[PDB]
Amino acid sequence: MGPSLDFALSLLRRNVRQVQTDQGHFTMLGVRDRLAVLPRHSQPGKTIWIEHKLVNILDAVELVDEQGVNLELTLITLDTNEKFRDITKFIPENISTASDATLVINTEHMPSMFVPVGDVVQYGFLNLSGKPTHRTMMYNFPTKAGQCGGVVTSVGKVIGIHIGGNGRQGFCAGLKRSYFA
Numbered sequence: 001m002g003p004s005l006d007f008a009l010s011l012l013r014r015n016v017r018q019v020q021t022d023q024g025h026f027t028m029l030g031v032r033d034r035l036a037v038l039p040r041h042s043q044p045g046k047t048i049w050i051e052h053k054l055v056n057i058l059d060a061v062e063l064v065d066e067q068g069v070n071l072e073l074t075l076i077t078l079d080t081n082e083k084f085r086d087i088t089k090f091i092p093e094n095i096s097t098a099s100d101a102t103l104v105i106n107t108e109h110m111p112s113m114f115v116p117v118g119d120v121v122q123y124g125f126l127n128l129s130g131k132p133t134h135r136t137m138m139y140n141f142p143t144k145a146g147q148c149g150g151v152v153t154s155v156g157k158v159i160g161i162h163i164g165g166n167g168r169q170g171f172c173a174g175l176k177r178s179y180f181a
């Protein structure tokens with residue numbers, strides 16, 4: 001097996017989970033220790049369903065920038081014995097572009113799904129169903145409902161979390177390492 005396929009499969013196995021909030025089905029990225037990230041609009045409560053069991057959420061942090069604008073990410077600390085394989089070193093220090101990215105989705109409805117979204121470019125501002133949102137990137141792929149939380153990936157790097165689309169193109173919140181420090 002090749003190194004690209006090995007990386008995404010290993011991510012799927014060790015770090016990318018099927019979850020459900022009151023808002024419905026999402027892919028969750030497990031970053032390190034008890035720390036995971038979801039799209040903000042998933043609105044995780046005091047518990048979240050994670051693959052086959054209800055998990056207590058110990059804390060939730062909605063990320064905003066300096067201007068107070070939505071970044072569309074929520075950091076959650078889970079009450080579990082597992083520590084996620086630590087993938088922070090695959091997350092760039094700054095929000096970074098990629099060629100030929102792959103979007104890795106893992107939901108009950110869309111399990112272990114690989115979507116070849118193409119190149120990922122800087123986008124910046126996005127209007128997200130009324131909510132202004134900063135620090136996003138774009139791929140010209142017609143992403144759909146159900147794929148939020150999907151992990152944008154390329155050459156052993158974890159660069160974004162899928163957050164929306166307009167029927168023609170798709171948008172991720174960009175990842176930087178310092179959100180997980």
Ligand SMILES: */C(=C/C(=O)OCC)[C@H](C[C@@H]1CCNC1=O)NC(=O)[C@H](Cc1ccccc1)NC(=O)CC(C)C
Binds near residue numbers: 041129165
């Ligand atoms: C991901 C969440 C989802 O499935 O829930 C809606 C039922 C979704 C992916 C989108 C849908 C169409 N194509 C996609 O890639 N994201 C959203 O639906 C965004 C929902 C949202 C609403 C209010 C606040 C935050 C997020 N909205 C969009 O993708 C629409 C445009 C970016 C404006």
